[PDB]
Amino acid sequence: QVASEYLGGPGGDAFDDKALAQNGDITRIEMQCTDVATYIKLRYGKVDSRQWGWANENCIQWSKKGVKVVHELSSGEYITSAIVTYGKYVQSITFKTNKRTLPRCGTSATEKSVTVLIPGGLKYISGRWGCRIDGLRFHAKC
Amino acid sequence: QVASEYLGGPGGDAFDDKALAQNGDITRIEMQCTDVATYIKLRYGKVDSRQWGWANENCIQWSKKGVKVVHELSSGEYITSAIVTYGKYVQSITFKTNKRTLPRCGTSATEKSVTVLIPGGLKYISGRWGCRIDGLRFHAKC
């Protein structure tokens, strides 16, 4: 389907939830959040992805870690906007749904910002990951 | 049906290409472009919409006219995103297709900016127009 540009940098390893998204609409968002977002993990229907970020605990040498944040989406709730600040990595992620605006993950927003609108709702994410979220790309439903 | 939020303001008169889109895919973009976008006119199959903007030559009183820009779309080419800067009006529009990026219409991009993903490709536009493009809404093939 239609996708945003890739937002972020070339570090880490590529991931792509395309195949996983065949299991359903996004029903859950989990992130690890300090001054920056250090991982993201969505649920597609009843199927969780791997943890995209915070590859290991020694990553604390190179950034802060953060707290685990979980947002459960209701039936018919979908993500219609993502405000991302980013450079070498994704710094912060602010998701808005058709029902509510979620708090930003990553308290610092000093990097370049982009607002991506996703009419009909986000279908899935791809990107790159390691100790943190090297980058993200947003994929729509068609 | 999937549609974006409306981007722009309340001036001008409403237009909607919904019915004309039953002719087929968008095959051509025509715009008038200066420091801002002053009109848009899409072709659905073989049929052009009305000129949505630059209502009369007296509009020189509030805006420069600009230059007519055309993008003939090839078979299978669909508009998949739009970067829009806007406030009271649409200021600038940068379309991207599944085959190429297109140049921005409107050299000024100083207003709030959003990147609209258009799932499945753009089906048609609605919005408001007068001497310029008061606002736009993107209706997707999804």
C-alpha dist (Å) from residue B3 to A80, B86, B116: 11, 18, 10
| B128 phi and psi angles, rounded to 5 deg | -140, 150
In SS3 terms, chain B reads as: CEECCCEECCCCEEEECCCHHHHCCEEEEEEEECCCEEEEEEEECCEECCCEECCCHHHHHCCCCCEEEEEECCCCCCEEEEEEEECCCEEEEEEEECCCECCCECCCCCCEEEEEECCCCEEEEEEEECCCEEEEEEEECC
Q: How far apart are CA B76 and CA B66, in angstroms?
A: 30
Residue pointed to by tokens 């802060």: A64
Is residue A122 a contact partner of residue A109, using CB atoms and an 8 Å limit? no
Q: How far apart are CA B105 and CA B92, in angstroms?
A: 6
Residue B59, SS3 per DSSP? helix
Which H or E element spans position A30?
strand A26-33
Is residue A109 a contact partner of residue A103, using CB atoms and an 8 Å limit? no
What is the structure's resolution, reported in angstroms to one decimal?
1.4
- With b meaning 16 or more CB within 10 Å and e meaning fewer, what string describes B127-136? bbbbbbbbbb
| A118 phi and psi angles, rounded to 5 deg | -125, 80
Q: Which residues of B touch A115 (CB under 8 A)?
A: 113-115
Residue A136, SS3 per DSSP? strand
Looking at the DSSP bridge assignments, the partners of residue B43 are B28, B48
Q: How far apart are CA B32 and CA A113, in angstroms?
A: 29
Is residue A30 a contact partner of residue A72, using CB atoms and an 8 Å limit? no
CA angle B106, A93, A76 (to 5 degrees): 95
Is residue A28 a contact partner of residue A75, using CB atoms and an 8 Å limit? no
Q: Which residues of A touch B80 (CB under 8 A)?
A: 2
A119 backbone φψ class: left, alpha, beta (φ>0; ψ -120 to 50): beta
Residue pointed to by tokens 């995209």: A52
User: What would the two tokens of residue A65 be?
Assistant: 């870690």
B2: nearest CA in chain A?
A: A120
Residue pointed to by tokens 């940068």: B94
Interface A-B: count of C-beta contacts within 8 A: 60
- With b meaning 16 or more CB within 10 Å and e meaning fewer, what string describes A88-110? ebbbbbbbbbeeeebebbbeeee
Which of A115, A117, A124 should one mutate to test binding to chain B, selecting the residue with the greatest count of B CBs within 10 A?
A117
Q: How far apart are CA A25 and CA A97, in angstroms?
A: 13
What part of B 80-99 touches A (C-beta under 8 Å)? 80-81
Is residue B141 a contact partner of residue B16, using CB atoms and an 8 Å limit? no
Q: How far apart are CA A89 and CA A67, in angstroms?
A: 18
Q: How far apart are CA A117 and CA A96, in angstroms?
A: 9
In 3D space, the residue among A5, A122, A138, A78 whose CA is nearest the CA of residue B83 turns out to be A5
Min Cα separation B50/chain A (Å): 26
Residue B74, SS3 per DSSP? coil
* Amino acid, res. B3: A
DSSP label of A129: E
CA angle B13, B52, B8 (to 5 degrees): 60
B141: nearest CA in chain A?
A: A142
**Domain parsing of chain A, residue ranges:** 2-142
A120–B2 CB contact, under 8 Å: yes
State how beta strands B13-16 and B37-44 pair.
unpaired
A7: number of Cβ within 10 Å: 22
Is residue A97 a contact partner of residue A77, using CB atoms and an 8 Å limit? yes
Min Cα separation B58/chain A (Å): 36
Residue B140, SS3 per DSSP? strand
Which H or E element spans position A20?
helix A18-21
How many CA atoms lie less than 13 Å away from B9 in the CB half-sphere? 13
The helix/strand count (H/E) of chain B reads as 0, 13
A116–B115 CB contact, under 8 Å: yes
Q: How far apart are CA B102 and CA A34, in angstroms?
A: 38
B115: nearest CA in chain A?
A: A116
C-alpha dist (Å) from residue B133 to A71, B58, B105, B124: 38, 16, 12, 15
Q: How far apart are CA B4 and CA B140, in angstroms?
A: 8
Return the CA Rg of chain A. Answer: 14
What part of B 17-76 touches A (C-beta under 8 Å)? none
**What DSSP line would sit under B112-139, residue for residue?**
EEEEEE-TTSEEEEEEEESSSEEEEEEE
Q: How far is CA A82 from the centre of its chain?
A: 9
